[PDB]
Design a protein around this ligand. Sequence first.
Ligand SMILES: [Mg+2]
Ligand SMILES: [Mg+2]
Ligand SMILES: [Mg+2]
Ligand SMILES: [Mg+2]
Ligand SMILES: [Mg+2]
Ligand SMILES: [Mg+2]
Ligand SMILES: [Mg+2]
Ligand SMILES: [Mg+2]
Ligand SMILES: [Mg+2]
Ligand SMILES: [Mg+2]
Ligand SMILES: [Mg+2]
Ligand SMILES: [Zn+2]
Lengths: 136, 177, 115, 60, 84
Amino acid sequence: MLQPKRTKFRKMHKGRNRGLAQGTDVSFGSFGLKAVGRGRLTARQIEAARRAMTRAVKRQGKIWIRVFPDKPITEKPLAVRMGKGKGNVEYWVALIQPGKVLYEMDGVPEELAREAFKLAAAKLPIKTTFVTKTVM
Amino acid sequence: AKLHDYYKDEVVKKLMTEFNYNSVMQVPRVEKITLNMGVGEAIADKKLLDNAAADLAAISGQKPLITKARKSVAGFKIRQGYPIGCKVTLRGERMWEFFERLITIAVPRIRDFRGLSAKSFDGRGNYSMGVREQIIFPEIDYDKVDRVRGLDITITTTAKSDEEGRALLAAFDFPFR
Amino acid sequence: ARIAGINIPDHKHAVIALTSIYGVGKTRSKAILAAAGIAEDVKISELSEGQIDTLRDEVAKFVVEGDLRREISMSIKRLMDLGCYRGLRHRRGLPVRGQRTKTNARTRKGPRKPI
Amino acid sequence: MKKDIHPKYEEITASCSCGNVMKIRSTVGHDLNLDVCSKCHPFFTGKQGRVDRFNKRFNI
Amino acid sequence: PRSLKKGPFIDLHLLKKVEKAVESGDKKPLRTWSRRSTIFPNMIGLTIAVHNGRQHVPVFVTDEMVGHKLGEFAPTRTYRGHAA
RNA sequence: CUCAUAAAGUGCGUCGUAGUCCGGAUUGGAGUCUGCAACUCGACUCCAUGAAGUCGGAAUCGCUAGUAAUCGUGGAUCAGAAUGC
RNA sequence: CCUAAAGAGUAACGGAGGAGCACGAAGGUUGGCUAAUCCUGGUCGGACAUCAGGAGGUUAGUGCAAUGGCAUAAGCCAGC
Ligand SMILES: [Mg+2]
Ligand SMILES: [Mg+2]
Ligand SMILES: [Mg+2]
Ligand SMILES: [Mg+2]
Ligand SMILES: [Mg+2]
Ligand SMILES: [Mg+2]
Ligand SMILES: [Mg+2]
Ligand SMILES: [Mg+2]
Ligand SMILES: [Mg+2]
Ligand SMILES: [Mg+2]
Ligand SMILES: [Mg+2]
Ligand SMILES: [Zn+2]
C-alpha cells in the first residue's frame, strides 16, 4: 500500500482531472500497461494490480510502477452533519489522465507479458491497453 | 630577520634551481603565521582565559585577540559570542624573529622530540602543528605557570601544493621525519 | 636546572632530583655524582652551570626519559604481538609473574568492580 | 603596531652549552642559558637481535 | 632461568628430530610433548605441534621470537570469562 | 668448628610534614642458586618503575606482668621453596 | 499564505500558521564587512567549541508567524 512518507500538508483540495497525461512513453522497460480512460487509482488498487502482475509472471523480468498515490482523499464518517470541518484523511489516490503509462515491465516474453497485463487490467478500475517500446 | 636574509640570499635561488621556475617570485613566500590557543574552559572560568591571554602575549610579544564563539553549540555548553579562544597573527620581521625563536630554541626543547610530521600539510601548501606544553618555551618561566597548557601553530604560505610547502620548509631545515 | 627535557627541583638535594628524573634511582644517582666528582650535599641552587653540563653529559652516557619509555613500550608490544604466555597475561591485564588470582591482584586488575 | 598595549620587548643574548651564542629579540628581559640548541640536538645532528643475543649469551 | 655456565636446555629427541627436519626439509608440523625445552636458531621458520594438556597446538617458530619456551607459547587453562 | 656480624638501642649528620629521601605493590631488563628441567609454577640479587594507602563504617578480637606491644634469632618439613607452625 | 478564477475585492463550523509585544539601542547618520554548509590540516578537542586553507554562492541572516523583499545590502561591526 503506497503512501508518501511525509507531506507538506495533511489535506488537499478536490481539484479537477482535466487534460491528457504525459509520461505517455515506455521509458525504462519494454512492455507497458497504459491508461485509456480517466479516473483515480487507490493505492489498494495499485497494490492489488502489482501483486497480480508479479505473481502471474512468477518473478522474472522487472516491474516498474510509473504512478504514485500522492493525493490524500478525505471521507466524513457516517451519521455526521455537513460542515464542522473537513473530514479526516482516509486513503490516497493518483489522478490518472488518458495516455498515462501505468505499469511497465521487461525481461519477459510477449505472451506472458500480455497475460499478466490482462490480470492487472482486470484489477484496475479504468480502461487500459498494451503498448510496446518504440525506438523513437 | 637573519632568517629573512637567509631567504632572500640563498633560498630563492635554491628554489629556482630544483624547480626550474620562470620567476624569483614564483619562488614562494610565507604569507602569515598565526598562533591559536583554544581556552574553551572559559565558560567554567573566564579568569583562566585572562591568564592564558597573558601567556600568549608573553610568547608573541603582541596583544592577542580574545576570540568568541561563532555559533552556539549544545555539546560544549557555549553561547554565540562567548569568548573561548586567543589568537595572534604574525607578519614580516615578526614572522622572522618568531620563526627564528621556534626553529632555534623551541623544537630542540620538545619533550621526546623525534621530528615533525611532513603529512601535516592541509593539501594547499600551508603547514600546521600542535604544541602540547608551552613550558618548552623560554618566554614563560617554570614556577609562575598556573596550569599546563598547549597551543597550535599555522604557517600559511603562498605555495600552491604540499610538495612546494615541504620544499620551502626543508630549505628552512624544518625538522621533518 | 634543565636535564633531559625535564626540570628538576631546585630547593632539594641532588640524589632526590636525579630520582625525580625518570630512569634514574638512588644508586644510579650515586653513579652520576661519583662520575661528576661532586659532593652530594651540594644543592641545585649552588650548582654551577658547567657542573650541570657534566651531569647532562653523564646521563647522556646513560639513558633516560623517552628512550627508556619507548624501549619499555616496544618490549611490551613485542611480547603482546608474539603472543607468549606473558603476552596473554599483559593482553588480559592480569598479573604476569605467577601471583595468585583467587584474591588480591588488585593493582593489575584495577579497582574492584561488583556485579 | 599600536602604542602602550604590547608587552615590553627588547634584544636578548642567549647562550647554548655547546658553545653557541645567538641574538634574539624577546620580552623576558634577562639573558638566556640554554640546554640544547639546533646545532647540538641529537635528531638535528642525525645521531638518533634475538639470535645475536642468544649466541653471545650461550655461545658454544 | 638457567645459569650462564650451564647453557640452554633441549631434549635429546627434540634435538634429533629438529636436526633431521633441518637436513630433510619441512615436513608436517613437528609433533612433540616437550613443553620444557627452549628454542634455538635451528627451527627458525618451522612449525611445531606442542602438547598442551589434550591436543597439539602448532606454533610457528620465527627469527624475532627465539629464546623462549614452547610451554609458555602453548596455554593450558582454557578461560573465556565469567558471566558469558 | 660452622650456621652467626643479632636487631630494636646508643652517638652524629640529613630529611622538615610533603603522597614526601614514607610506602614498596606492579611492571621492564640483567643475573645467581637448587634441581634432569624454575614456562604454566621457586626463591633470591642488581638496575629501572613507583600503585593503592594520609590510621580505616556498622561491627568485632587479644591481653592482668616480664603480660600486652615491639625488635630480632633458631628449628621441623625440605634438593630448592615461609608473612605459616 | 491558500481557496480567490494573472487589477482590487470576494463566503463557509474551508485548509495552515501567528499577535495583544520588544528596543535609548535593536533608532539617525558616517565608515567598513559579507553568509549557510562541507572537506583537508592541527594540543587537550571528540561529529560539532577555537584557527588556517579550499569548495560553495545566500542553500545564511532579518528581535518574534508567513508572504513579498534585501549585496547600493534592509544582513554584520565600530565612531558620533
Ligand atoms: Mg629499586
Ligand atoms: Mg605462588
Ligand atoms: Mg591516593
Ligand atoms: Mg602525612
Ligand atoms: Mg617475628
Ligand atoms: Mg628448606
Ligand atoms: Mg486577485
Ligand atoms: Mg480576476
Ligand atoms: Mg460580491
Ligand atoms: Mg554604507
Ligand atoms: Mg540599520
Ligand atoms: Zn647547542
